[PDB]
C-alpha cells in the first residue's frame, strides 16, 4: 500500500527499493511572443531515481529533443518517465532489480504499472509523505550536468557522498530530506548556509561539503531554523 509516517522504517531494510520523482522531467520557461501571446520553451529535465538505503542515484537526463513534435507533453512526460524507469530495471542484473518502486506522485502509478507489466512481482506504490525531491535541481552539480547535456544520458551519483561510512541509512535520508526541504523553501538562504565558510570544500567526487560531524550538527540546526522561519512568514503565525 501507500508509504506514510507509520511504515517509514521499511525504507531502510534490506529489500531493494527505489523512489521515482518525475517533477523535473518536463521543465519549461513561459514567455511572450512577438504578437503578445504566451509560448513555452522546454529545457532539459531529469528523472530522479534513488535507492534510499544505499544512496545510489540514477539520474536520467531528459533532453529537450524528446518533446519535438509531440502533443500533451505534460501527459507524455509521465509515460516517458515510466518508459525510462522500466528500461533501467531491465538493464539491472536480477539480484539488483528492486522489489518495490515508490512514485512520489500518484499520477505516475498507471503509467509505471503499465510499463512494468513484464515485472509483476515488483510492487508500484504511492506515498503519503511530502518528499522534497523537486529541489534536486538546486544541487549545483545535478543542475549542471542536466543543463550541459547534448543528448539522452544517464549519470550515476551517490546522493549521500561518504556519509554512510559514519551514519546510518535512516540518518542519511533524514539529512538529505532536511537539506532538500530547506533548499525548496528558500534556496538562497539554504545555499548560503552551505557555502558560507570557504574553508569547507566539496570533493570533486561529492555533491556536498566535507563537513565534520560537529559542523553537520550546526548545519542541520541552521537548516531547521530556516524552515520554521519561512513557515511563520508564509502563514502569519
Amino acid at each position: 500500500g501507500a508509504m506514510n509516517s507509520s511504515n517509514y522504517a521499511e525504507l531502510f531494510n534490506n529489500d531493494i527499493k527505489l523512489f521515482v520523482d518525475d517533477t523535473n522531467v518536463y521543465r519549461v520557461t513561459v514567455h511572450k511572443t512577438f504578437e503578445g501571446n504566451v509560448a513555452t520553451k522546454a529545457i532539459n529535465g531529469c528523472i530522479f531515481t534513488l535507492n534510499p538505503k544505499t544512496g545510489h542515484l540514477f539520474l536520467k537526463i531528459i533532453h529537450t529533443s524528446v518533446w519535438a513534435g509531440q502533443k500533451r507533453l505534460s501527459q507524455l512526460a509521465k509515460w516517458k518517465t515510466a518508459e525510462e524507469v522500466s528500461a533501467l530495471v531491465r538493464s539491472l542484473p536480477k539480484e539488483e532489480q528492486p522489489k518495490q518502486i515508490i512514485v512520489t506522485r500518484k499520477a505516475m502509478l498507471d503509467p509505471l504499472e503499465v510499463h512494468m507489466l513484464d515485472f509483476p512481482n515488483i510492487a508500484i506504490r504511492p506515498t503519503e509523505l511530502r518528499l522534497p525531491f523537486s529541489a534536486a535541481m538546486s544541487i549545483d552539480k545535478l543542475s549542471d550536468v542536466v543543463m550541459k547535456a547534448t543528448e539522452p544520458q544517464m549519470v550515476l551519483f551517490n546522493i549521500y557522498d561518504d556519509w554512510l561510512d559514519r551514519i546510518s541509512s535512516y540518518t542519511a535520508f533524514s539529512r538529505l530530506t532536511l537539506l532538500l526541504r530547506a533548499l525548496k523553501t528558500n534556496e538562497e538562504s539554504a545555499k548560503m548556509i552551505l557555502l558560507s565558510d570557504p574553508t569547507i570544500t566539496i570533493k570533486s567526487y561529492h555533491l556536498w561539503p566535507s563537513f565534520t560531524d560537529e559542523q553537520w550538527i550546526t548545519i542541520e540546526s541552521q537548516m531547521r531554523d530556516l524552515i520554521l522561519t519561512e513557515y511563520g512568514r508564509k502563514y502569519n503565525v
Binding site: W79, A82, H115
Partner: protein, 300 residues
C-alpha cells in the same frame, strides 16, 4: 406460444418471468406460465418470501425442449427440469390450462422491451458462460462469483465471462504502452472482437447477459462485467459506426428497464461519467445520455 408448467408451489415465493413477476402464496394452486413468446431466451426466477437473500433462476429457450419447475424439499428450492416424454408433457400442459391454473406471460403487443434487452443473447453462448452441459437450461443466483473474481474458489459454480483487464499484457502491446492504454481500439477490435468474440453480436450478447444477471439476481460480478464491456467500447477511439449506434440502443433499454430504486449499486459512477462525458464516444450515446440525465442526474 410455449408453456412452463409447475408441479406445485409448496412455499411462499415471488416468481419472475423475464421482466414480469407474481406473488404466489404457500400451497397456492399455481401450475405454470403459458403463452411464453417463442424466439427469444427467457429467465424464470425466484425469491422466497422467507429469505429475501439469494434470488435464483433459470435461463432457457423453449425451442430446445420441454421444461418444467418442481420444488425440492431436500435442497429447498424450485428446480428446473426437462421432460423428455413429449406426449406426457403436452398432457400435463393441456390439463393445467383446462383447469386454468396458469398465468399468461403478460406481454403488451406494442412492447419490444424483452426483445430489446435480449437481442443478441443466444442460449448456446449462455451455456458456455454457465457450464453445466447435462442441462439445456442454465442456473444463476445472487451469490455466484465470476472467473475473474475467483483469480483475485469452486469452479463448478462460476460465471465464465470473458476476462477484461485494462492493465494486462493482453490489453497492452509492448512499445505501444501509452497508446494502447489511452486508446483501447486495438484491445477491442483485434484482441476481443476479431480474436475472442469473433463478431460484435457475441460481444453484445455477453454484455446483455451480464446486465440482466446483475438486474435480476443482483450478481455483483455480473455488474462488474457489464461495466467493463461498456468502458472498453467507450474508451476506444476507433469503433465501427454500427456498433456505436447499436450500443446506444442497447444501453437505453437497459437504463430504461432498471428499477429506479437500485441505481446506487448497479450503476458505477465513474464508468458512466467517463463514458458519457470524457471518453472518445461521449458524443455517440445520445439516447443513453438523455435518459441517464432525466432519470438519474444525481449519479452524474
Amino acid at each position: 406460444m410455449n408453456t412452463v408448467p409447475f408441479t406445485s408451489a409448496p412455499i411462499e415465493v415471488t416468481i419472475g418471468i423475464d421482466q414480469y413477476s407474481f406473488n404466489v402464496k404457500e400451497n397456492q394452486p399455481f401450475h405454470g406460465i403459458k403463452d411464453i413468446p417463442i424466439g427469444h431466451v427467457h429467465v424464470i426466477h425466484f425469491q422466497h418470501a422467507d429469505n429475501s437473500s439469494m434470488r435464483y433462476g433459470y435461463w432457457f429457450d423453449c425451442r430446445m425442449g420441454n421444461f418444467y419447475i418442481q420444488y425440492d424439499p431436500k435442497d429447498g428450492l424450485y428446480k428446473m427440469m426437462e421432460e423428455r416424454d413429449g406426449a406426457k408433457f403436452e398432457n400435463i400442459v393441456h390439463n393445467f390450462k383446462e383447469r386454468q391454473m396458469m398465468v399468461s406471460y403478460p406481454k403488451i403487443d406494442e412492447d419490444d422491451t424483452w426483445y430489446n434487452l435480449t437481442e443478441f443473447v443466444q442460449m448456446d453462448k449462455i451455456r458456455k458462460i454457465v457450464r453445466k452441459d447435462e442441462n439445456q437450461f442454465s442456473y444463476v443466483d445472487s451469490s455466484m462469483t465470476t472467473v475473474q473474481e475467483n483469480e483475485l474458489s469452486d469452479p463448478a459454480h462460476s460465471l465464465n465471462y470473458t476476462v477484461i483487464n485494462f492493465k494486462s499484457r493482453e490489453a497492452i502491446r509492448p512499445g505501444h504502452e501509452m497508446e494502447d492504454f489511452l486508446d483501447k481500439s486495438y484491445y477491442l477490435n483485434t484482441v476481443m472482437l476479431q480474436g475472442i468474440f469473433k463478431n460484435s453480436s457475441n460481444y453484445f450478447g455477453e454484455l446483455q447477459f451480464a446486465f440482466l444477471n446483475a438486474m435480476f439476481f443482483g450478481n455483483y460480478g455480473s455488474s462488474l462485467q457489464w461495466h467493463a464491456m461498456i468502458e472498453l467500447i467507450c474508451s476506444s477511439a476507433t469503433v465501427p459506426k454500427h456498433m456505436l449506434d447499436k450500443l446506444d440502443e442497447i444501453l437505453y433499454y437497459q437504463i430504461k428497464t432498471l428499477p429506479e430504486q437500485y441505481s446506487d449499486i448497479l450503476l458505477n459512477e465513474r464508468v458512466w461519467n467517463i463514458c458519457l462525458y470524457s471518453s472518445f464516444q461521449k458524443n455517440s450515446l445520445h439516447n443513453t445520455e438523455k435518459i441517464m440525465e432525466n432519470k438519474y442526474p444525481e449519479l452524474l
